[PDB]
Amino acid sequence: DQVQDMYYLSPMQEGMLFHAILNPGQSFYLEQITMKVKGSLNIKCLEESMNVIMDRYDVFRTVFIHEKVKRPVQVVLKKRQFQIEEIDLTHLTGSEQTAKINEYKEQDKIRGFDLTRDIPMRAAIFKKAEESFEWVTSVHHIILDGWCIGIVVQDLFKVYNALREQKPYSLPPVKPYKDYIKWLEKQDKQASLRYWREYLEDFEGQTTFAEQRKKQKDGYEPKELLFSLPEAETKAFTELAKSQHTTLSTALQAVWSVLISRYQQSGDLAFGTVVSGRPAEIKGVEHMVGLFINVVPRRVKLSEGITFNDLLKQLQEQSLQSEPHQYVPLYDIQSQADQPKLIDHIIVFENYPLQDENGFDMVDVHVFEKSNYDLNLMASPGDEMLIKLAYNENVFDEAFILRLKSQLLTAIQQLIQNPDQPVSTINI
């Protein structure tokens, strides 16, 4: 028997499987990480390590069954042999190499995975010269969300550097993903839907930045504007969040709420927020690897005279309230609102972005994921906080995105200088 265990899918996994099967070739749920290596890499040993990781993390050994079954199940296989696709490009010119690697990345996006058979993760390493490699890893988020990859990479290099130097290693114990499925089977699914319904009671709908949306035919032209919050502002922003017993993520969502209240001319608004999805009742949940994070609606109410510190408190409390119900798929929430466009942009605060020795230099790490919203506000910590506006240029002009950058920066500065004044006083 190849099967170690078999159990049901989380609601989000089930939604993901259904949409993946029905929309093949479209890059859904696919993350592609490109690592450019400069230095010595022991590929054979890297492969050995990957297979240690295969046995360490049950999600990599999981496949899915949906045919001739009453309800889909995920099956953990006792052992699965991983193999790196190693490609030697050394006999090609530099332009040939790049074309070769882009060709691979483009066909890889279309290929996706057959979730009923494949390991939902693969790796190709391209050798371009003696000490230069390009290492493309693809993964399906039904087994591992984007905020988990770092954990796995860290363990992979720990195994790798021990194996190559012939040293012993030990790794901390990790709970299996089934433990999260078991936690989910104790939750009251109807109470969680009721939570979202009541939270969203009487919320009416909103096209964000409607007067700025280009009304063109459908299509996605992905663009990005990257910028940073200067260190002194970043410091004061962080101090304010700490002093108010909240997070940088919540503080940024609060500032964004003020900006959107002005464009929408309204005090009742919504946007999507990526939440961790990790239940505190699950001892050791921070070390688990699998699909946890979710996009949920954030609804913000701005009354007359509300201050920034008021807003920080309103959002911090609702985050905590929401925590037992973060497993509900957005689709099911939107159906409880008879509003398929309840939200149309999101805010993503990523504490530990993969994109910032082992005997080599990591020259660059780039992440690709397909875009599901026409505007995405993305931020990560640092001495100067890193902010990205990722948008669909077929909808928003670059000039408008640039105005949004200067408004966000001036709104941060003004709300941290006067966090106890009505946010209606801020000049944007």
Numbering used by the authors: 7 to 362, 370 to 441
According to the publication:
Variant 10, harboring mutations W143T, Y145V and F155I, was found to be the best catalyst for rapid fatty acylation of l-Leu, giving an apparent rate constant of 38 ± 7 min−1. Introduction of the W143T, Y145V and F155I mutations causes the following three connected changes: (1) the N-terminus of helix 4 shifts inward, toward the pocket mutations, by up to 2 Å; (2) the helix’s capping residue, Trp153, swings over to interact with the base of the latch; and (3) the latch shifts to pack Leu360 into the mutated pocket. However, in this conformation, the active site is not connected to the expanded mutated pocket, mainly because of the position of Glu37 and Leu360. Although this model is consistent with the mutations improving activity, cocrystal structures will ultimately be required to corroborate the proposed binding mode. Structure-based considerations would certainly have included mutation of Glu37 to a smaller residue, as the side chain of Glu37 blocks the fatty acid pocket in all crystal structures.
These natural products are biosynthesized by multifunctional enzymatic assembly lines, called nonribosomal peptide synthetases (NRPSs), that use dedicated modules to incorporate each building block selectively and sequentially into the peptide scaffold. NRPS modules typically possess three core domains, which perform substrate selection and activation (adenylation or A domains), shuttling of activated substrates (thiolation or T domains, also called peptide carrier proteins, PCP or CP domains) and peptide bond formation (condensation or C domains), respectively. In the current study, we re-engineered the donor substrate specificity of the SrfA-C C domain (green) to enable direct acylation of the acceptor Leu (residue 7, yellow highlight) with a fatty acid rather than an amino acid.
